[PDB]
Subunit: 156 residues, 10 copies
C-alpha cells in the first residue's frame, strides 16, 4: 500500500546519513544508480528526499550503502518535497538556478505562451539529465535538459 | 558610453507599455526579434527589462512598437535585473520553474559537483532555449535546455 | 497572436475599474457571464485578472461594462496570475480557504497519494463552481467543487 | 475533561511515528478509519495532528498502529492546528491547493458575497472530501468538494 | 445587488479622504454615527474600510462629510478587509492588541477549549464596544467588549 | 532574588510536559488554579510560559502535576514572553484574535484616541476574561472583555 | 475635537515636504522648536510624523516653514506611528540603535527585572534627549537618555 | 590568542545553563559582577552571550556559578552577537526599546546629524547603564543612558 | 545648516532623473566626478542617494546634468541610506557582493578578531575601490579593495 | 570520488567543535593554515564550512585539532555554502560588510558596468586576503582584497 510523508526532516536526515555512508564508501551517484534501471538524476533525487524509489531499487541502493530496514522503507515513501532550506538558496551552485528564474522567468513565461499557449510546462511530467561537454572557447559547459509536457489552460 | 539602471521599476513600466503596443499591433516576440540579428529570447528579455539592447536593435524594435525616444534610450541601459515581483513567483507558468528548484536543486548541485567539480554553472555565460516537441502519446512536450559554463572553485 | 502580461498590476488596476462600473450598473457576476458560453467562475476570474477571455467574450462583457478598446484587449491577454496581495490573505472570506490548507493540506496530500498515487491533482486542468444550498439546521451552506485531473509522477 | 496543546511539534512528531508504524504494517488510511464511525478525512487529519479523536477512536487506531498509552492520550488532545511548515507549501501536491487560492481566491470571495452576502464560508463548520472519477477523455479526475456554513456579517 | 472589492487600497484611500474631511469639519466618530441606527464601532470601521454601510447610513455619513457619489457608493461595497499595513502593527496603540495575543493567545486558546469546547469564538458573528471608565486606583480604563458566538468543531 | 529567562524555549518545553501530565491526570485549568489564590487566567498563562508563579503557587502546582524541582524553580522565573510560534497564528482558535486586529485594529485606535486621547491602552496593567453566555438564538456566545489602563502620551 | 490618522504615508509625505522647505530656508530643528515651549525632540518627532502638535505650536512651526492650512491641521493629528520603512533600518545612523537592541536587549530585560521587577519600562510615559559631550580621549560623544516609567506586572 | 564564535547557539545555550545555576543559587547580576572590576551591564551581557569576559572575570563568575572549564573558556570567546530570536522582540520588556526605534528613530537620526554631523553614534565604543529613580508623581522611573562616540562620515 | 532626509524615495527618485540626464548626455561617472576633488565612488554614491555632496560639488554636477535648484539642494542633504530595494539584491552584479558575505562573512569575522581583536572594521571610516587588471590567462580581473578602520570593543 | 553536502548544519556543527578544540589549544587560524600550502582565508573558510580541503590539508589540520576520521572526511566534502544564520547578519562585525552593500551596492554595479561592461565580477573565481595595516592617523586598518574575474554578458 502506498505510504507518504508529511514532514521533510525525516527524509532529509536520512539523506545526510546516506551522504556520510556514500563518502565513507567513496561512491558516486552514477554507481549507486547503476543496476537500478533508473536514471542517475531520479535515483539521486530520491536519496536526497525528493522522489520515492520502488522497492527493488530501494533494496539495491540500501545494500550498496549499508542502510537499515527502516531507511530502506523510508526511501519508498512518497516524500514531502522541497529541498531548499528557506525558499531562496544560499549555496552559489544552487543559487545560479534561482538567478536564471530572476533573469529569464518572465521571458520563459512569454515564450511558453507564444509557442504553446495559455497553460504551463509540467514540473511533474518530467525527465532530467546533466551533461558535461567541452566549451569551444575553452573549458567545460553543462547541458541540462528538462523534458516536460505542455498542459493547456482552457476556458470552462 | 555605457549607461545603467538602479531601480527596476523604470524598465518594468516600459515593459508594460511595450506589451500594450505589442498587443494593439498584434505582434509576436518572433517577429519583433526578426531582423535584429539577435536571438528571440535575448530581444524578449530586453523588452521585459532583463537585458540591454544595442542602439540599432533598440531603434528597430522602437520603430516596430512606436516607442518614443526616451524609451529607445532606456532599452539600451544595462538593467537592474530581477523579474520576480516578490522572490517566489505567484504565476503558475513561472512557478513551475521555481518548483523544479524545490524538487531538483540539491540533485543539480550534487551532479554538477560529481560531473564537473566544485564551483558553479554560470548563468551569465549562458543561453536558455525552449523547443516544442510532439509527445508520442498525445499532446505537446516542451524541452527546455539550460547551457552554462562551468566555473571552478579552486583552493588558493 | 497570443499576448501575455508580466506585471499583475496592469490587470488588477483594470479589475478595480471593472468593479466600479459594475457597481454603478448594479450588475451581478452571473449576469455579466450570461451569454458568454463560459462558467461564472471562469469569467469572474478573468475580470479579476486571473484568466484570459476569448475575443468574443471580452467584447460581450466589455459592452455590458462600457469598457474601452484597450480594456477589452487587456482582458484577452494571458495574465500574470496571483490574486493574493502578500501571500497570506488578510480578508476573512479569503482567509478561510487558506485556513482550509493549514488544517487539511497534509490530509489532502495523504489521501491524494492513497486514492490516485504519487503525483498531483492538476490546478491548470480545471473547473470550479460555487453552489448555495440550504443548511438543514437553519441558514445556508456553500458547496464548492474543484474538478481536476490526476497527473502521476513516475520514475525515469 | 478536555485537554489542549499549544506547540504543534508534539503532535507532528507523533504523526511521523504514526506514519513509520503505518508503513511498517502496510496499512491504508481507509482501513485505519474503518470501525471508528468517523470520516476518513477526519481520522486522517487527527493522525496528522490537525483534529482530536474521541477516546473510543483513539484507542481503536492506537490498537491498529501499536501506539503507547501517551500517544493514544495525545491523539485525544485538541491540537495547535497548522500543518504547513512555513506558510506556503513547498510540496507540489499541497502547493496546487495554494495555487488555487492564488488564481481563484478573489473569485471565491466575489461569488460568496454575490450568492450569500457579506460574511464568510466557515472552515470549522466544514467538511472536505476527495472522490476519484475516470476522465471520459482518458485518466483519472479528482473531484474535491469543500462544504462550509455561511456565516453572515451584519451591522450592529 | 451586492458589490464587493478585491484591492484594499481603494477603500483605504477613501478612508484617508474621509479623515481629512472629518478633521476639517472638526467632527467626532460618535457624531458621524449619530442618527445612523448603528454602533459607533461599526460605522467607524466602515469609514476606515473594514465594513460595508447599508445604503441609508452611507448617504447619511456622506452628507455629513461632503463626500462625492462614487465615495458614497464605495462605502456600500463589501470590503477587502485587512487594516494592518504589513501584518504586525508599528503603531503603539494598535501594537498593544497584538501584544495581548503574544502574551495571552495560548491561554485564550486553552480557556476557550475548557469553557466552550473545540472550536473557535467567531470574529464575525460579532459586536464591539469601547467604554472609558475610572480606574479605582486612579486614572482611566478602557473596557473593550468583544461579543462573539462560539462555533464548535465536532468530529465528522 | 528575582530571576528571568531570555530564551522562551526552556519554558515552552516545560509547558508541553505540564500539558502531558495534566492530560494524564485528567485535570482542568480551573482545578489547577483552585487553592492557589491566583486567577485561572494568570495561573494558566504561567503554566504556558507567559507569567511567573510566586514560590508557594509554583510548589502547589508542582505537587498537583508531579513536577520535579528544576521545573518548580523554572515556573518562578520571569519569562521571555511570546507564545506565537512565528508571529501570525496558524491555529484557528488563536487566529480569530489576530483577525479581530486586522478588522478592528484601526477602529480601536480611532476610538481610543477619541475617548481617551493620545496614548495607549496598556497590555501590562490589564486583565482578560472570557465568559459563556447562551445566545437568544441557540448556542453559546463568548463575551470576551479586555480591560486595560489608559496611559497618555503628552507633549514635553 | 481630537483627530487621528490610520495610514502613515499622509504624515510621512508631509514630513518630506517640511524637510525641503526647511532646507530651502536653511533652518535647524533647534530654531524651529524655539518659541513652542516644547522640547526639540518632541517637535522634531511631530514634523517627522511621530507626534501630534498642539494647535499653537502647529501654527507657529507652520508659519516658519510656510505650510498651508491643511498641513497645519495634519500636524495636529494623532499619527499612525512607525518611522522605519520596513522593520529593520537600512540607514547606518538609525541602524546603530537597532544594533544596541541586538547586543543589549536581553541585558536590558534582565536588569530591568532585577532593579524594578516584572513588567516594563514604558515607551509612552517616556522622554528622550540627545546631548553632545566632549570625549576625554579626543572627539565627541552622544549621550542619549531614555527616561521612562516602570510599570509593574503583578499576579492577580 | 583570541578565540571567536560563529554560531550564536553555543553561547546562548550556555546562557540558559548559567541562568538555571544563578536561579538555583538565588544570585543577582549585581552580585555576580562584584569583584570583577567591570560594569554590571557588561558582565551581564557576557553571561547572556553578547560580550566576551577577560580570563580573570570568567574565572571569578565561573567560580560563583559553579561552571565547568569548557564553559569558563566559552565565556572568553568573542561572541556571534545578536540576542533577538527573530529580529523583532516578542517580549514586552524588550519590545519597548524596539518601539522607541519605531517612534523616535528618524528623530535620533535628524538630531544626531544636526548636533554632530554626517556619520553615526557608535554602538561599539558604547557604555550603557540602567538607573532606578523615584517619580515625583509616584512610582519608579528607569533612566537608561546610551553613551556612544560620534564617528563622522566625510567625503573621500 | 546641515539638512537630512528620512525617506529614501526622495533621493532615489532624483537618482533615476539623474541617470536619464546622464544617458541623454552620454556621460560617464568618471566625467561627472571630474573637477569635484572627490573620488569617483564617492560622487557616484551621492548621485545614487547614498552620500551627501558638499555645496560646490553639488553645483558642479548639477550644471553638468542640467538639474534644477531643488535637486541640487537635495544632493547636499544627508541621505537616508540603503540602496537595496528589498534586503537581498536581485541583480546578478550586485548579488555577487552579497554572496561574498554568505561564503566568507564568518571568515572575515574570524580573521578580523584574530588580527585586530574584538570589535569591528568600520563601514563609515571606510572607502572602497574597483581596479581593472589584465588576466594573464585571458580577459579582465576586477580587484575590489575594501579599506576600513578597526574599532575595538573593550570591557567597561 | 568527490562528495558533497546538502544541509549546512552538518559542517556548521563540525565548525563549532573545531572552534572549541582550537580554543582549548590556544591555536590561531594562521598556525592552523601553516604548512598546508593554502591561504589563511581559504583554510579558515573550510573549517567554517564554506570551502572543501584537499585530503592532505584535511589530514594536517585534523592532526593539529585532534579531529576524528569522520571529521577529516567531512572537511573534504564540497559544502552547502551559506554562513549567515538568517540572511542579514546580526553580529556587528559581519553586519558592517552587509552595510557596505546597502551603501555602495548600486555604486559598485554602476562602476563595474562603466569599467568592465555588462556582466558580473564572478564571486567564485577568487582570492581574498585580509591585511592589517597601520593607520597613519593612529590605530589600525583592515585592507580586504577581493580578486575576481570579469565575466561579460553579451547579446546573442
Ligand atoms: Cl543526469
Ligand atoms: Cl527559445
Ligand atoms: Cl497540536
Ligand atoms: Cl475523502
Ligand atoms: Cl464603542
Ligand atoms: Cl476567564
Ligand atoms: Cl501618521
Ligand atoms: Cl535633544
Ligand atoms: Cl546598569
Ligand atoms: Cl573606484
Amino acid at each position: 500500500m502506498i505510504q507518504s510523508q508529511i514532514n521533510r526532516n525525516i527524509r532529509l536526515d536520512l539523506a545526510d546519513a546516506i551522504l556520510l555512508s556514500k563518502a565513507k564508501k567513496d561512491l558516486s551517484f552514477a554507481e549507486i544508480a547503476d543496476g537500478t534501471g533508473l536514471a542517475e538524476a531520479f535515483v539521486t533525487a530520491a536519496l536526497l528526499g525528493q522522489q520515492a524509489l520502488p522497492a527493488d531499487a530501494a533494496r539495491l541502493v540500501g545494500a550498496k550503502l549499508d542502510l537499515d530496514e527502516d531507511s530502506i522503507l523510508l526511501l519508498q515513501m512518497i516524500p514531502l518535497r522541497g529541498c531548499i532550506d528557506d525558499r531562496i538558496p544560499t549555496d552559489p551552485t544552487m543559487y545560479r538556478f534561482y538567478e536564471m528564474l530572476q533573469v529569464y522567468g518572465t521571458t520563459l513565461k512569454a515564450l511558453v505562451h507564444e509557442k504553446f499557449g495559455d497553460g504551463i510546462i509540467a514540473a511533474i511530467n518530467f525527465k532530467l539529465d546533466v551533461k558535461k561537454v567541452a566549451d569551444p572557447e575553452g573549458g567545460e559547459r553543462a547541458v541540462i535538459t528538462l523534458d516536460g509536457k505542455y498542459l493547456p489552460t482552457k476556458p470552462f
